[model samples]
Target: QVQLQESGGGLVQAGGSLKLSCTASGLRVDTHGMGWFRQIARKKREFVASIDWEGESTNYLDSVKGRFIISRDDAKNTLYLQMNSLKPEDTAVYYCAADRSGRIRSVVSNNDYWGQGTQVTVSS
Candidate 1:
């Protein structure tokens, strides 16, 4: 019954990148994919992507497609996410989630379990 937690800086410059890490406890790292999502200012949630145990990734719905990537360090049981070319609209609380199958269903895109979201503000 492992759980995930997100930790990172709260502020990032408009042109800078945002880096966040998700740490999982009480579960095997090889069992699932780490999913990332974001809630932008005055908007609905967006699915960023997911990273498998081997570091393979897939983007389900990326509005800023090339600007974001997800990775994982199996040895550390940690998931990493980086968003480059930040903009004011990028400011939001990012969350880390996990699914056993690594494949997310279109009908239920919302993560089954979520980490305490980390807020990232892209400003001047």
Candidate 2:
């Protein structure tokens, strides 16, 4: 079976930087590449960024293209997210997941699957 685990979360003061990680387990060609998503309060899931497992370029949501950074390492199996210069509003639950319908070297299609999430609470 395919699954994902997320960590690197907790709380942060306003104007601090945050980093989170997602690790994938199991065996599936479709679960190689990964993307980072976050669920904003009172809103739907937001697409943050995506990275391929084979070392292709990454894609970020235009909305967050300015405030978020996405990265991947062969861990050989981990995805990372770092947001610098953040404010209280940047707090939310961040999730890392793999692309399903797309190429392992490209973006993952719809929400193939989601497992764990890191809750980031920013304060003053």
Candidate 3:
């Protein structure tokens, strides 16, 4: 049974870069990709990225294609999400999701399971 824990909440200024992490135990991040999602307080969640098991094929939201990134660290069983060029509208909370269940624990992006969440607000 793996549950997600997030980093301490923080703030970001416009044009600044942001970094957040989600760590999961019992679900090995070294074996497969995990999904990263974002939600602006009261809005619907957005699918932002996925850390490919291969450690290379990571994907991100089209609008942020060049600014969003997701990476994994097997040593810590964590997934990291980084974004460059922040904006006020980017203020939101992000979480981690896993799909691997049954035999092996993996990560996926859906409403089923979500991490504790890291809160972030972009300031002017």
Q: Estimate the TM-score of every prediction.
A: 0.84, 0.80, 0.83
Error of 1 at 3 (Å): 1.7
Among these predicted structures, which one has the highest lDDT?
Answer: 1
By TM-score: ranked, best first: 1, 3, 2
Predicted model with the maximum TM-score: 1
Off by over 4 Å in 3: 41-43, 101-112
| Ranking of candidates on lDDT, top first | 1, 3, 2
> For model 2, how does the per-residue alpha-carbon lDDT over 4-28 read when each residue is reduced to its tens digit?
7888877888778777877777734
Residue 4 in candidate 1, Cα distance off native in Å? 0.7
> Where does candidate 3 have its weakest 10-residue lDDT segment?
101-110
What TM-score does candidate 2 get on C-alpha atoms? 0.80
Candidate 2: worst-modelled 10 consecutive residues by lDDT: 100-109
lDDT of 1 by residue, 29-90 (tens): 56776778777655577777776645554664557678877777788988788788988887
Decide which is better by TM-score, 1 or 3. 1
What count of clashes does model 3 give?
Answer: 5
